[PDB]
Structure formats: C-alpha cells, structure tokens
Amino acid sequence: MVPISPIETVPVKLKPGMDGPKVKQWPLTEEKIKALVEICTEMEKEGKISKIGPENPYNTPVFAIKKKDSTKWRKLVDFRELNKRTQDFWEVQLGIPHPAGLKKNKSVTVLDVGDAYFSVPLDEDFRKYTAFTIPSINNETPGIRYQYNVLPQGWKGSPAIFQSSMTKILEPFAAQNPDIVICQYMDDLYVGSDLEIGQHRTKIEELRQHLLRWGLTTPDKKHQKEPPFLWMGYELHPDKWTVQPIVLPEKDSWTVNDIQKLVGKLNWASQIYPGIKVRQLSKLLRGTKALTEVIPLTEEAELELAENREILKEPVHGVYYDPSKDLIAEIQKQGQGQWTYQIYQEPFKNLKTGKYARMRGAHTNDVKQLTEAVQKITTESIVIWGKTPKFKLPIQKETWETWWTEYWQATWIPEWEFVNTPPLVKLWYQLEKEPIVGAETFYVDGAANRETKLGKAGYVTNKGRQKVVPLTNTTNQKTELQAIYLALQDSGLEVNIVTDSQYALGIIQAQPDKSESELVNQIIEQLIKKEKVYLAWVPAHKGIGGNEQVDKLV
Amino acid sequence: IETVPVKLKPGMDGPKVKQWPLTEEKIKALVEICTEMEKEGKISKIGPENPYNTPVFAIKKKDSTKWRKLVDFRELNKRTQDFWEVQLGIPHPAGLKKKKSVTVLDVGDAYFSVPLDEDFRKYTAFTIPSINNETPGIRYQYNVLPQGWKGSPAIFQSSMTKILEPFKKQNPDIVIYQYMDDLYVGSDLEIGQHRTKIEELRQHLLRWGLFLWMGYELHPDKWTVQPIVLPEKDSWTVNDIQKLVGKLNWASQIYPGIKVRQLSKLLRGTKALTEVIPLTEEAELELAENREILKEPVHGVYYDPSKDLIAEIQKQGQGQWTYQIYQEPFKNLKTGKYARMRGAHTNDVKQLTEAVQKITTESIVIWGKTPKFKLPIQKETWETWWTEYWQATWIPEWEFVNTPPLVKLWYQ
C-alpha cells in the first residue's frame, strides 16, 4: 500500500438554535426500494455511506427516479430541509472570470475529476444529520438506515467544501508552476499553459503525479472536450472568445416575457457585439408582473431591433488579454441616455464591448452621464484586468475643464484623450457669475391656489415691461418655473432674472441639458438660445424689489 | 498572553461585507504583507466554514513609499459590543485641543503582540481577491488584535497605560491621547524638544517592547474657526444688496436679532440689478447692528457625547473648501476653510478626500470621535476613487448630497 495523505475535513455546524432535520420518509414502490437497496449497497461498499443504528433521530427523504426509461434507477436524497438548517459557507464560487481577462494558452488539457468529489470526507460530528431511510418491502421490517461519510450531492456545503478542498491540494502545484493555469468547472480540471506541447504534457504528468499523493486518479485524459469550450455562456477558443450564439427570435406577436427575454440576450451579447441598444425594447416593460400580455412594439423598438439583428448578422469575437500592451477604452453617446463602449489594446481587436444607460431621474446632463459611464468602465476594468484603461472620449478637453471647475460637486475622470467622433458631448449653456450691465432685469414670480389649482406666473422689469398669465391645474412649483420661462421668452439675448424660487434654482444650478418635465425642457431650450443669463436668487416675502408675489397672489 | 473575551452586540451576527475590486499593485502588496504576517502568526488561513468578511485594501501613509494594509472594520466596529473597559471610558482630554502643537504617532503595530479571543477571530475574516477572480481569494482571519478594530485600543489600553507611566510622570504637562491606531501627543514645548519628547517617546516605546518613524504635526492652538462677515463697500448695487439680504436672512436662522427690513426697503421697486443704491441712515444702522450681532458667539451651543457629529463640506472652487461640524442644525460647533497645493490641483476627488481626513483628524482631537460626512459628490464617483488617496488608518462614515446647497456662497 502506498500511503496517501488524507483530505482534511471541514468543521460544519447547524445554524444557531436550529436542530437537524426530521422529515417523513414517503411510501415507495417495491421496485424502487429494490432499486435503492442495490444502489445503496454499492455506495456502502465504496465508503460513501454507512448503515446506522436506530439511535439517530434525524431523517431526510430519499427518492427513486428513472433516467428516462433507461436500464437504470437513481437515488435522490432531498436535502432541502437539511439545507435550510445548515450554517452559511464562504461560497468562494462567486463573480466568475470574464473571458476578456484571460490570457492566451495554446495548450489546454482537460482532466476528469468525478471520482475526487467523494474523496472528500464529511465532518464526522455532522454526518448523523444526513441520515436517510430506505423503506422496507411492505413495511414489515424496519427501513434500512444510512448516513453519509462523504459530501452529499445536493447538500448546501458541498460545492464550497469541494472547491476549497480541491484548491488546497492544487495550491502547492500552482505556486511552483507559475506558467500554468487551472480551472475547476463541473467534474473537470482545465489546465492551460503556453508551453511547447512537449513541456506541457510533462507538466500534466506532474499534476497527475501530484494528485496521486491524495489518492486521486484522473482517467488518463485528453478529454472528450477540445477547443472550443462551452463555458458559462461563452465559447472559449485557443486565441479568441465570444458569447455562445445569439439567435434573435422572429415573431409578430411579442409578449412581456418574449421581450424581456430579448433584453437578456441583447445584454449578454452587448459584452462583445458593438453598439447594441436596449432602451426602447426595455422601455416597454415597466409594469409587468403578468407575462402573457401581447404588447405592441412602438416604431422606435422596431428600428432598434432592426439595428440589433443587423449587428448580430456577423459573428463577433473578442481577443484575450496581453499584459504587455496598454488597455484602452472608447465611449460613444448613442442618444436617449444611451452609451456604448469598447475596450481594446490594439485597434479593431476588442477584448470586450459594453453599454451604459442613464440613471432614472427627472433632470440630467450628458457630461454627468459620460462621467458615470467612465466610473462604471473603470470598476469593471479593475475587476477584470486589475487596472484602469486609458479613455478616449467624445468630449473636448476645454469642455471638460469648464465643466469640472465650475460644477458644484467634486468630480473626476481618470487619464483620457479627446476622440473626435460625433456626436460630441458639450455644455449647452453657461450662466453668468455676475449681473449683466445694460441687460434688462426681470423680476419673476408665480403662485397657485392649493385647492383650486389655479395660479399665475409673470414678471415686472426695470424697463416697465410686464406680464401676468393666468394658469389652470398648476402648483406653486410649476408656476415658479413658468415665470422664469416667460422672462426668458420675452427678453433679448442678454438678461438678468431675479427669482425667489429655491426650487427652480435647485434645478437650474444642477445644470441639466435635458429633462422629463417639458417645462424644464422649454426653459433649457431658451437658455441655449441666449448669449448671457444671470440668475439671481432673493428670499421670498422680504419686501425685496419687484419680487411681485402680489400680482400673482390674486 | 491571556485573552480578554469578546462578543458582538446581542442579536447581531458578524460582518458579511463584499470585498471591492483592487488593483493589481494593491493585490500584490497585500499578498506580500499577509504572507509575512502569516509566518509571524498574526493571521491564519481559514476554510469555507467561516462565512464572514470585512473589506481590505492597501495605502501609503504620510511621506513613505511602503504599503500598509488597511482593513475596513466599520461594520465590525458597529457590531462589536461597546467595550467598557476598566477605564469607565476615558473622559476625552478637553485640553489636547488647547495645546500649542500635537504630533500623531502610528502605534498600531503594538496591537500585534496581544492575542485575540479565539471565539471572536472568525469575525475578523478578510479576503485578498485575485484579478479577474481567476483563482479563489486568499482567506484569512486574525490571531491578534487587528489594526483598525475598535476593541484593539480598548483591550490594549491596560497595556498602553503602564508603557507610558515613566513618560507621563517624567512629563506631567504633555497631553497624550489614543484613538484607534493613533497616539496624539500634545505639549506647548517648541518643536526642538517637542520633537525630542516624541523621539524620546519613540525610543521609550521602542524600548518598552514596541513604521513608528513617522510623525504628523498639527497646531490646534491656531486652528481655522469661522465668524460670519458682511461686505464693507462704499457703493452698493441692487445686486450687492440682494445678496446681503439673502445672507442676513440665512444668518437670522443662526442669530435671532438679525434684521433686514431697513435694507430690503432699499429694494422697493423694480430696479436694474447693476444700479448703485445709496444706503439710507436706517439701513446703514441695521447693517451695523447686524455686524455687532455677528461678532458675539452663537447662543446655546453645546457638545453632546450621546449624539453624532455631522460634517458638511462645500466645494468653493480654485482649490478652496469650506466645512461645518454640528449636531443640531444651525448650531455649529466648528467651521473651517481649506486650500492647499498638496498633490491635487486637477483632482477634485483627491482634494475632497484630503479635506475629509483633515476634518476627521480635527474632530478626533476636539471630541474623541469621527463625524458623519455629507459629501458634495455623487456616490459612484466617490466610491470608485477615495481609496486611491486615503492615508489614514481609520475611516469615517459618509453620505452623499445630490442637490446643490443654496448656502454655498454664504460660507465663502
């Protein structure tokens, strides 16, 4: 006998207070029992399980399921209850590697490790909680009682403990072989390197020798699997990757589900298929808990979907990462709060692509969205490559400087360069810092009757110009904006406007270039037409000049 | 050698905070540091049965090129049982703020000589992530008091007090205060021997067991305080007067005797904003009466240890920043103004991050705790960049202000 190192077990406990499961074993059929008896006898012989006394009071229901009328039966131990009662684990299985982060490996060997899973002992003091019973033929004898000695498939802590046990064993091998990579995916170990297929096979032979130390044998494997690999929805090729084929459904009748299911695909594809849009197609689905609703596609969605299929026409691949070359990220404004980007090291060879959608809000600005997209790409790039990419942005250096030095909030974009590809992001208007000499001064105001919803908006100026417009179905807030709007409509190219509205100032000082409120949009449209605008605020009801609340109090 | 038992607050579990993305350089630094800390028994690898987690990252302190590991124990701290030691809670040294000068020493290393309560260790778990998560993250837990944990100074307090008696007795006028991994040493002795008293204190510390080489000097005796002031002009335009009335109306929420009637009267009529208006007698007297009022201190302003400190910061442009610390609205306990050429002339966020640290430091010296910040920045921008410019061993709390404060100019 060749001594083999044992796999350290992981101390498992049940959640605080809770106790093991105690679930009723259901009546089975004579043939299923005989089926289970056979299976379990064989599992016992292998060490996976062990018959237990009548002491253990815990129980988990077992079942028999036929593998689609084949010459076989399968045992199904339902650990759902036990799982609800098992402590939480460190699911070190989160946030998978993104294909664009991988490096090239001309040689990728696959080794099978199905039999290693059971080579993993179950914490001794925890086994009893895994007890199950094979009912007896006709219920005339006590059912056969068993308990696990190994991680049970379907048990909450199996995925985590297996990965951690496998990693711990591979650890010393990976550390001393820095020129190879190993990845656990299902019952397999994928070992890649970029060594000459000769020095690569040696290294595989060494891994097998190393694994033997723990008694783990891998059927001699040049697996039934060779490039391209289907993994996590992607297709990994020797020197390139892509998402698994995206097939846009053809229909005349699209329902809530069909549409959102169309979203997911477009979203998944957007990581490599450039310029994908999902604003309109996603637009239609806010209010759907019901999924069979045959909803119509606005002419916008049809155009977006047509632009989609087109991009999906040709298959697109992304390259792998080369740590020796720079990382570059390019962004484009797509309209309607939509942005698209590509990250690459060499022109025309993207590592991956992506998109960004403006956050929901009533007022917004292109520069703020460009900035948010930059932050998002920065974080994703830190995740994938451990570094910030150099940005190429459609905004002039001068526009950015004017923006951040005057913005009331602190803001920042990392190293970047202007890329002149329309439509360029710009500032649409810039308020004055000082009152304008020679420009007419408009004192505006508005008010509304909370009950009747009747109101008025208007202005009086230093030249005697005046206006008061009566309004219906309005509020104070809207009348204050309307007043500002009237002043802008009725003034020349340069104008000073005095308001007591903290609300309107709150909006205008946020510098929006677009809004959901058509009233804010009309004001923005007027701002863009002016050459100079000074907006001044004064406290309401302080006997301050021209602040004619009276004209509007009526 | 003996460990003081520790537990969380009744009904709360340990932290389960996500590790945020780290750059390759920070990851490499952490692997090197943690490898060495592991050889030294300070931390130990942990298995999947430990579900807890606290974020970790790396920084470079005041003028050194050596990476320091910083664990973000903010969550664990608010879940760690209020540690009332044999100290009864050391009544914050109200005299530290009055001292001519103060040097801040990093004595966190000392903590690593005291073992941690075995049953509590699991709660200090942290992960060193891998780029693109290609390999599973390295999981560890502490075996000794971790730097940055609330219970570390508390538990090591008894050890610290006796390690300084020779000094405290040798130097009775020097005020020494401890906050987290920092020791604040204040005295009126000029740098010459204030430096040497520290250098003496360093040796004294280096001998009594325990990068200590660093020092950070502050001058709380000459700190930035802020009274409200009004313009002094020979000719006031309508706009100047509208701005004055706005500012006085604002101050009237802080000071009760403020009047604007006589000044707003001057604003009776729809006049051109740039037209010069001569001040009436009544208006000029009201302005004088307001100036006098603004020179007295704010009324009924007191600090309360049971309440949080709140710090508001405004970007004034051109590298200048203003801030106010209070507990009750309009009852400022401290206000200030900043502007320096410290590695951030084109970086808004680096400046704000530096301002946040100076304000916190100031707050520690004065009250013995950190304030809750209201930052003039979008959450996503701040959370993406602040760790690149952080140089302190503690980390305060913060929230974001998304609506422009109308009161910006009135503070500058």
Ligand SMILES: Cc1cc(/C=C/C#N)cc(C)c1Nc1ccnc(Nc2ccc(C#N)cc2)n1
């Ligand atoms: C994530 C991953 C999945 C599989 C495979 C899982 C499955 N199924 C195989 C390996 C070896 C890895 N790990 C790494 C690590 C670094 N670079 C790479 N590059 C790389 C990977 C696959 C191909 C191919 N073909 C080419 C290059 N892979």
